Amino acid sequence: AVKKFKPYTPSRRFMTVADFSEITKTEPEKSLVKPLKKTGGRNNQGRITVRFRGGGHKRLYRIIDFKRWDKVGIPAKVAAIEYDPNRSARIALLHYVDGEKRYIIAPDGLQVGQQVVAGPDAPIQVGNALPLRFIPVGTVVHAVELEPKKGAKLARAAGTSAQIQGREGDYVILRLPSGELRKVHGECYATVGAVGNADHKNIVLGKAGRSRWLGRRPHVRGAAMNPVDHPHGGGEGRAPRGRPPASPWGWQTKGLKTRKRRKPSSRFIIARRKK
């Protein structure tokens, strides 16, 4: 569910927040958090590389286990489910029987207190990680390693999920959340089930202040700029594009495929994303 508000102020009229029903623990684990380096779009040269970033709320980076193969066979218990501000997903605090506490992305349906286990001997039930060759075909997964032993790189946002469409040799075929069919190796790990907090996209921010709280600075339109700042700028009065819609650096932004054609990953991608 998504919590709404009465229109007591103009911003509270459309502003919506999450239900936060799955969160059981308020503060995070002290042995797993570390500070987050706020950049504000600035690189090591001190220049803005990514425009309009900064001014967000202070955050602490929660160390998330994106491997799960450090502890193969050792079961864990979902001690609590907390909120991570560095992502859209909610996290699950895991107390292993070995004694080590860890954090993973909380999948949808993961209840507090149940037991999860990673490895090829693990059963097929939400929260368990297995290599892609042992997960049955047709089941939805997440936290998928793209290449073996490199960490979870796929299906990490809230409400996302990938489905095994088949196997072919040493690799498996996967429908990514973009609808792309890709051939990923079978030894790559993946946690079964879809990611929780599926109502994340239904959050209306309500006002400009909420974007500034998240770190989203105001985006300036190129038409509102001048010719030295953008190609769309200029023209006495409001004016249309007058050229194909381009970025401030010159490249067009309406249809230009910027993917390198000679990339070696093209040999493993079956179908490009659609819709």
Nearer CB in complex with Mg ion: 124/256: 256
CB 33, min distance to Mg ion, A = 7
**Cβ nearer to Mg ion, comparing 124 with 198:** 198
When asked if residue 98 is in the footprint of Mg ion (CB under 5 A), the reply is no
- Cα separation, 53 vs 174, whole angstroms: 34
Instruction: Identify residues 55-94 at the interface with Mg ion (CB under 5 A).
Output: 56-57, 61-62, 84-86
Bridge-based pairing state of the strands 171-175 and 181-185: antiparallel
Task: Provide the 10 A C-beta neighbour count for residue 69.
Answer: 16
Residue 12 gets the label, from left (phi > 0), alpha (psi -120 to 50) or beta, of alpha
Q: Cα torsion at 51, 259, 133, 112 (round to 10°)?
A: 20
Give the closest residue to 104 by CA, choosing from 127, 85, 125.
127
**Amino acid in the structure at residue 217:** R
| 244 contacts Mg ion (rule: CB under 5 A) | no
Closest approach of RNA to the CB of residue 238, in Å: 4
Cβ proximity to RNA, 120 vs 248, nearer residue? 248
Binding window for Mg ion (CB under 5 A); candidates: 94-102, 118-126, 155-163, 235-243: 235-243
Q: Kindly state whether residue 138 participates in binding Mg ion, applying the rule CB under 5 A.
A: no
What are residue 191's DSSP bridge partners? 129, 142
Spatial separation of the C-alpha atoms in residues 46 and 81, rounded to whole Å? 37
Stretch that binds Mg ion, among 2-10, 161-169, 177-185, 262-270 (CB under 5 A): 2-10
Positions touching Mg ion (CB under 5 A) are 1, 6, 10, 13, 19, 21, 27, 41, 52-54, 56-57, 61-62, 84-86, 208, 211, 218-219, 221, 231, 235, 237, 239-242, 250
